[PDB]
PDB file of C-alpha atoms in Angstrom:
ATOM      1  CA  UNK A   1      -2.511  32.313 -82.656  1.00 21.99           C
ATOM      2  CA  UNK A   2      -0.351  30.412 -85.159  1.00 23.12           C
ATOM      3  CA  UNK A   3       1.857  33.431 -85.835  1.00 23.34           C
ATOM      4  CA  UNK A   4       1.866  33.994 -82.072  1.00 23.46           C
ATOM      5  CA  UNK A   5       3.066  30.393 -81.709  1.00 24.60           C
ATOM      6  CA  UNK A   6       5.822  30.796 -84.325  1.00 21.61           C
ATOM      7  CA  UNK A   7       7.280  33.653 -82.271  1.00 21.66           C
ATOM      8  CA  UNK A   8       7.207  31.754 -78.969  1.00 20.55           C
ATOM      9  CA  UNK A   9       8.826  28.753 -80.662  1.00 21.02           C
ATOM     10  CA  UNK A  10      11.550  30.896 -82.219  1.00 18.49           C
ATOM     11  CA  UNK A  11      12.139  32.548 -78.845  1.00 21.93           C
ATOM     12  CA  UNK A  12      12.431  29.059 -77.324  1.00 21.79           C
ATOM     13  CA  UNK A  13      14.908  27.835 -79.972  1.00 21.02           C
ATOM     14  CA  UNK A  14      17.161  30.775 -79.196  1.00 21.54           C
ATOM     15  CA  UNK A  15      17.049  30.147 -75.449  1.00 22.99           C
ATOM     16  CA  UNK A  16      17.487  26.390 -75.809  1.00 23.68           C
ATOM     17  CA  UNK A  17      20.572  26.927 -77.958  1.00 24.80           C
ATOM     18  CA  UNK A  18      22.059  29.307 -75.390  1.00 25.88           C
ATOM     19  CA  UNK A  19      21.324  26.728 -72.664  1.00 22.69           C
ATOM     20  CA  UNK A  20      22.957  23.948 -74.682  1.00 21.73           C
ATOM     21  CA  UNK A  21      26.140  26.009 -75.088  1.00 22.51           C
ATOM     22  CA  UNK A  22      26.217  26.856 -71.376  1.00 25.62           C
ATOM     23  CA  UNK A  23      25.663  23.281 -70.262  1.00 25.72           C
ATOM     24  CA  UNK A  24      28.330  21.982 -72.658  1.00 24.51           C
ATOM     25  CA  UNK A  25      30.810  24.475 -71.201  1.00 21.87           C
ATOM     26  CA  UNK A  26      29.954  23.365 -67.662  1.00 18.22           C
ATOM     27  CA  UNK A  27      30.064  19.661 -68.553  1.00 17.20           C
ATOM     28  CA  UNK A  28      33.395  20.016 -70.345  1.00 15.57           C
ATOM     29  CA  UNK A  29      35.069  22.376 -67.907  1.00 14.56           C
ATOM     30  CA  UNK A  30      35.737  24.819 -70.724  1.00 10.90           C
ATOM     31  CA  UNK A  31      37.656  27.858 -69.482  1.00 11.95           C
TER      32      UNK A  31
ATOM     33  CA  UNK B   1      -3.487  20.434 -83.273  1.00 13.88           C
ATOM     34  CA  UNK B   2      -2.949  24.182 -82.819  1.00 13.63           C
ATOM     35  CA  UNK B   3      -4.396  24.157 -79.304  1.00 11.11           C
ATOM     36  CA  UNK B   4      -2.354  21.000 -78.721  1.00 10.96           C
ATOM     37  CA  UNK B   5       0.705  22.973 -79.857  1.00 10.11           C
ATOM     38  CA  UNK B   6      -0.063  25.937 -77.570  1.00 13.65           C
ATOM     39  CA  UNK B   7       0.020  23.583 -74.578  1.00 17.08           C
ATOM     40  CA  UNK B   8       3.320  21.941 -75.543  1.00 18.23           C
ATOM     41  CA  UNK B   9       4.856  25.377 -76.122  1.00 13.63           C
ATOM     42  CA  UNK B  10       3.629  26.668 -72.765  1.00 15.49           C
ATOM     43  CA  UNK B  11       4.966  23.523 -71.098  1.00 14.64           C
ATOM     44  CA  UNK B  12       8.307  24.175 -72.824  1.00 13.93           C
ATOM     45  CA  UNK B  13       8.450  27.837 -71.724  1.00  8.38           C
ATOM     46  CA  UNK B  14       7.999  26.755 -68.126  1.00  8.50           C
ATOM     47  CA  UNK B  15      10.747  24.139 -68.344  1.00 10.77           C
ATOM     48  CA  UNK B  16      13.124  26.424 -70.232  1.00 12.03           C
ATOM     49  CA  UNK B  17      12.707  29.103 -67.572  1.00 10.56           C
ATOM     50  CA  UNK B  18      13.437  26.597 -64.804  1.00 15.01           C
ATOM     51  CA  UNK B  19      16.529  25.452 -66.740  1.00 17.53           C
ATOM     52  CA  UNK B  20      17.722  29.035 -67.198  1.00 12.55           C
ATOM     53  CA  UNK B  21      17.475  29.676 -63.447  1.00 11.73           C
ATOM     54  CA  UNK B  22      19.331  26.448 -62.644  1.00  6.80           C
ATOM     55  CA  UNK B  23      22.112  27.099 -65.127  1.00  7.59           C
ATOM     56  CA  UNK B  24      22.544  30.685 -63.903  1.00 10.01           C
ATOM     57  CA  UNK B  25      22.912  29.392 -60.342  1.00 13.09           C
ATOM     58  CA  UNK B  26      25.524  26.858 -61.457  1.00 11.98           C
ATOM     59  CA  UNK B  27      27.389  29.389 -63.612  1.00 13.17           C
ATOM     60  CA  UNK B  28      27.420  31.984 -60.838  1.00 14.36           C
ATOM     61  CA  UNK B  29      28.160  29.667 -57.940  1.00 11.97           C
ATOM     62  CA  UNK B  30      25.069  30.920 -56.144  1.00 14.35           C
ATOM     63  CA  UNK B  31      24.712  29.293 -52.725  1.00 14.84           C
TER      64      UNK B  31
ATOM     65  CA  UNK C   1       3.366  26.273 -91.109  1.00 14.92           C
ATOM     66  CA  UNK C   2       1.466  24.328 -88.435  1.00 14.56           C
ATOM     67  CA  UNK C   3       3.115  21.038 -89.386  1.00 12.88           C
ATOM     68  CA  UNK C   4       6.383  22.980 -89.568  1.00 11.72           C
ATOM     69  CA  UNK C   5       5.674  24.171 -86.016  1.00  9.12           C
ATOM     70  CA  UNK C   6       4.899  20.654 -84.736  1.00  7.74           C
ATOM     71  CA  UNK C   7       8.361  19.538 -85.865  1.00  8.54           C
ATOM     72  CA  UNK C   8      10.193  22.456 -84.241  1.00  6.61           C
ATOM     73  CA  UNK C   9       8.257  21.873 -81.015  1.00  5.84           C
ATOM     74  CA  UNK C  10       9.049  18.157 -81.022  1.00  4.22           C
ATOM     75  CA  UNK C  11      12.703  18.965 -81.694  1.00  4.96           C
ATOM     76  CA  UNK C  12      12.590  21.371 -78.733  1.00  5.56           C
ATOM     77  CA  UNK C  13      10.991  18.806 -76.386  1.00  8.66           C
ATOM     78  CA  UNK C  14      13.794  16.383 -77.154  1.00 10.38           C
ATOM     79  CA  UNK C  15      16.499  18.972 -76.501  1.00  9.91           C
ATOM     80  CA  UNK C  16      14.823  20.303 -73.362  1.00 12.21           C
ATOM     81  CA  UNK C  17      14.618  16.786 -71.944  1.00  9.27           C
ATOM     82  CA  UNK C  18      18.307  16.185 -72.655  1.00  5.03           C
ATOM     83  CA  UNK C  19      19.112  19.521 -70.969  1.00  5.06           C
ATOM     84  CA  UNK C  20      17.013  18.629 -67.925  1.00  5.67           C
ATOM     85  CA  UNK C  21      18.889  15.336 -67.501  1.00  4.68           C
ATOM     86  CA  UNK C  22      22.263  17.066 -67.861  1.00  4.64           C
ATOM     87  CA  UNK C  23      21.431  19.818 -65.400  1.00  4.80           C
ATOM     88  CA  UNK C  24      20.083  17.317 -62.856  1.00  3.70           C
ATOM     89  CA  UNK C  25      23.343  15.366 -63.092  1.00  4.05           C
ATOM     90  CA  UNK C  26      25.366  18.546 -62.558  1.00  9.02           C
ATOM     91  CA  UNK C  27      23.146  19.750 -59.704  1.00  7.77           C
ATOM     92  CA  UNK C  28      23.256  16.373 -57.967  1.00  9.64           C
ATOM     93  CA  UNK C  29      26.910  15.585 -58.551  1.00 11.83           C
ATOM     94  CA  UNK C  30      25.946  12.305 -60.183  1.00  9.81           C
ATOM     95  CA  UNK C  31      29.025  10.323 -61.209  1.00 11.52           C
TER      96      UNK C  31
END
């Protein structure tokens, strides 16, 4: 379960980073 | 603590999925 | 690894909450 957790967490970190980049672009009016 | 973690992670997956849907709508101009 | 996980999860909760606040502002047209 722990190694199952590590994978879910790593999957979340990737998605949260993509979301942060998207939201920054929208907040800043980039492009 | 592990079963405490599993719950926090599952709570995060739900919120991250809602955020992804919201950001896609905003990025795409849906509706 | 478990205490490593707890930290990553807590870091994620903080970022997900900031993202939720940002997206709500954008969705609502706040300010």
